[PDB]
Amino acid sequence: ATYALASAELIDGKLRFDSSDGFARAIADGFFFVKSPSLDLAAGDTFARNFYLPRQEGLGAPYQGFSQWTEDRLARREGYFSRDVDQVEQFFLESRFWQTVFPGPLLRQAERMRSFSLEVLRAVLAELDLPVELWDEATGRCLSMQGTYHLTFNHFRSHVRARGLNVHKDSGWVTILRSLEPGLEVLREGDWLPVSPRPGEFIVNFGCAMEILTRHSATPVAAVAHRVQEQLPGQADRFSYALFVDSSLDPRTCPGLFRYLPGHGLVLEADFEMFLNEILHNTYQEN
Ligand SMILES: O=C(O)CCC(=O)C(=O)O
Numbered sequence: 288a289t290y291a292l293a294s295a296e297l298i299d300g301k302l303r304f305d306s307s308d309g310f311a312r313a314i315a316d317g318f319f320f321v322k323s324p325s326l327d328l329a330a331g332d333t334f335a336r337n338f339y340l341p342r343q344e345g346l347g348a349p350y351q352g353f354s355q356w357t358e359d360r361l362a363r364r365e366g367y368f369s370r371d372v373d374q375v376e377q378f379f380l381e382s383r384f385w386q387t388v389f390p391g392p393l394l395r396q397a398e399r400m401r402s403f404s405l406e407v408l409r410a411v412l413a414e415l416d417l418p419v420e421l422w423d424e425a426t427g428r429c430l431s432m433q434g435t436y437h438l439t440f441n442h443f444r445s446h447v448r449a450r451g452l453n454v455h456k457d458s459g460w461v462t463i464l465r466s467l468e469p470g471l472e473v474l475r476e477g478d479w480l481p482v483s484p485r486p487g488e489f490i491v492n493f494g495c496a497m498e499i500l501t502r503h504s505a506t507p508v509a510a511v512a513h514r515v516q517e518q519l520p521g522q523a524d525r526f527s528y529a530l531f532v533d534s535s536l537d538p539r540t541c542p543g544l545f546r547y548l549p550g551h552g553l554v555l556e557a558d559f560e561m562f563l564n565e566i567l568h569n570t571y572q573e574n
Pocket residue numbers: 439441464466470471513515526527528529
């Protein structure tokens with residue numbers, strides 16, 4: 288519970304770690320720190336503290352009242368959610384909705400977070416056993432701006448009596464997490480490792496797609512389980528928000544989940560269109 292994650296700075300398109308073993312620990316730990324490149328985080332910090340409030344007429348109004356943005360106005364699992372089994376009250380939003388839903392300054396912050404997240408992804412791929420010509424297809428066309436990018440906000444309600452948020456692994460490639468306060472814990476060597484945020488840095492982790500891609504290469508990358516500890520009603524309300532990078536979900540753009548096989552190239556391990564054809568037949572037969 289005292290192990291320190293590796294930490295890097297993004298310089299000239301490569302991750303410069305503060306120790307020589309840093310990249311190797313990062314892909315073994317599944318989590319690592321990256322210095323924020325002087326990003327303006329105020330619009331996101333404001334939204335994180337206001338989206339769930341009722342909207343009034345102050346200067347915070349554009350960041351308030353996002354209970355109006357529910358799934359029926361967006362798509363399923365997008366928008367505002369007050370779930371109760373964990374403390375977390377959330378706002379999920381994929382990039383195609385950003386210009387419509389977010390105020391100007393938050394729109395710009397989300398777009399800069401997305402581009403930063405993709406620079407981090409490219410910097411990781413540069414160190415992996417993965418030929419450069421395969422990067423765009425291997426990672427689901429997220430690098431050519433055809434992927435799925437969520438900015439998600441977490442409001443931890445101290446007055447609610449439950450887990451911060453339950454154990455989960457992320458689905459996609461990289462996640463860039465902005466947080467200021469303790470609570471995050473990650474699974475390392477069987478034990479839960481508390482991770483305290485560092486000022487001016489993001490926390491980065493990998494998702495299942497990244498592990499599927501690399502686990503048969505010379506440089507397997509771990510997607511690691513993580514959770515948030517219950518926040519106490521001794522004046523908590525913790526806040527966080529993260530940019531999730533996922534593959535395109537359109538089989539006509541990304542056929543599914545690849546594995547890289549050294550010497551052989553990319554092999555399609557999950558064929559999205561084939562699976563959708565099977566679901567159609569099951570749905571047809573089931574009724
Ligand atoms: O709030 C945190 O510290 C982590 C949040 C997280 O992992 C998530 O939103 O998926």
